[PDB]
């Protein structure tokens, strides 16, 4: 059976980056040709693998993570990056193996008046571990006094909204992102081209 890449790339809705989705791809045939045909990809690059040779490869598993960030943020989806996204929302490991694909999604993901449905975590005490997903909504404590679930001075809701508007500059427009991680265990491979 084919690996269900279309289910990930062609989904009508995408996750907010702080709650990024993950699909475990196992026991299937990875036909990365569907990726090859479309020219809509503004970002398509791989680490420790050559994207053109992907149909030649076998892995124990593939993971496929997806979410929406803003264009100026797509560069933080790479090992060793810093920023609100890399630090507090989606972290790749320093020794990542896999690919990063992204495309402009202003048409789907922006609204006249502003899309407020897409969020990122703006406040967090310390950096995410690789592939960590923090969906906490605890009031963030910025001073020494406890917030006790109440917003106020030094007590801020951790998640904030992009104001995605279709007329924003390109670097402020939403982008959809899929990260393909390739997992190689000391075990038989279940995903091949």
């Amino acid at each position, epitope marked *: 059976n084919l690996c269900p890449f279309g289910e990930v790339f062609n989904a009508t809705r995408f996750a907010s980056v702080y709650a990024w989705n993950r699909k475990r791809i196992s026991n299937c045939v990875a036909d990365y040709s569907v990726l090859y045909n479309s020219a809509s990809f503004s970002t398509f690059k791989c680490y420790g693998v050559s994207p053109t040779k992907l149909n030649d490869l076998c892995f124990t598993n593939v993971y496929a993570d997806s979410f929406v960030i803003r264009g100026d943020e797509v560069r933080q989806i790479a090992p060793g990056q810093t920023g609100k996204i890399a630090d507090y929302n989606y972290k790749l490991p320093d020794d990542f193996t896999g690919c990063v694909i992204a495309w402009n999604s202003n048409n789907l993901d922006s609204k006249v008046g502003g899309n407020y449905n897409y969020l990122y975590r703006l406040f967090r005490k310390s950096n995410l571990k690789p592939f960590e997903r923090d969906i906490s909504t605890e009031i963030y404590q910025a001073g020494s006094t406890p917030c006790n679930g109440v917003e106020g001075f*030094n007590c801020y809701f951790p998640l904030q909204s992009y104001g995605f*508007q279709p007329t924003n500059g390109v*670097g402020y427009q939403p982008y959809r992102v899929v990260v393909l991680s390739f997992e190689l265990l000391h075990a038989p491979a279940t995903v091949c081209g």
Partner: antibody
Amino acid sequence: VQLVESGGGLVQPGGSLRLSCAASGITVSSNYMNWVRQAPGKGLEWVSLIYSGGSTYYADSVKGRFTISRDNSKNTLYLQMNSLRAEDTAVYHCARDLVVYGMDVWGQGTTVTVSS
Amino acid sequence: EIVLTQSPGTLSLSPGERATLSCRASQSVSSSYLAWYQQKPGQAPRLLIYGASSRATGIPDRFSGSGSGTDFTLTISRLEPEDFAVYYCQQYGSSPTFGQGTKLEIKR
């Protein structure tokens, strides 16, 4: 609640200076913190930013020369300046940055004069 | 990055009048990351507005903001003698940038 900057002073072109900013009422290590400077009769210029998790950023006019850092024990923010130039003459403020909510707390600043 | 251009350089108005100050961005941006500050001579800036339109805590009622994309506005409903200072707008990309400032002076 207050931020108090220290370390400003006179410095020969090329010399080094370290600024400090002691905080009361906010936890430096838990905030985006900025150094923002203002040359006399001029506007405000952002200089450097440190994330609570440790990421740091710098304006192009000081990259390579300035280093923002902090001391959790002393609840204090620092700015290390090297290869100082006449153009760095300014009042230096630290501020607590809430990004979406702007910079709500500011210090009165400390003045740095670079001159022969 | 984003360049903020404020207009006019100097605004000459009398106490009790309405003031309108402008801030123009070189690219269209989310209004969620636009703030306004007031600075008086010799004093640290004071935050007035965040999110283009939300008045920071403690800020008197006569101050308000609006706008979207490239054009944002700070309005002072009826000027108080203390309002004649410098105002800056601020926008957040990767990091803060400020406009160059507008001086409110007393017309006479």
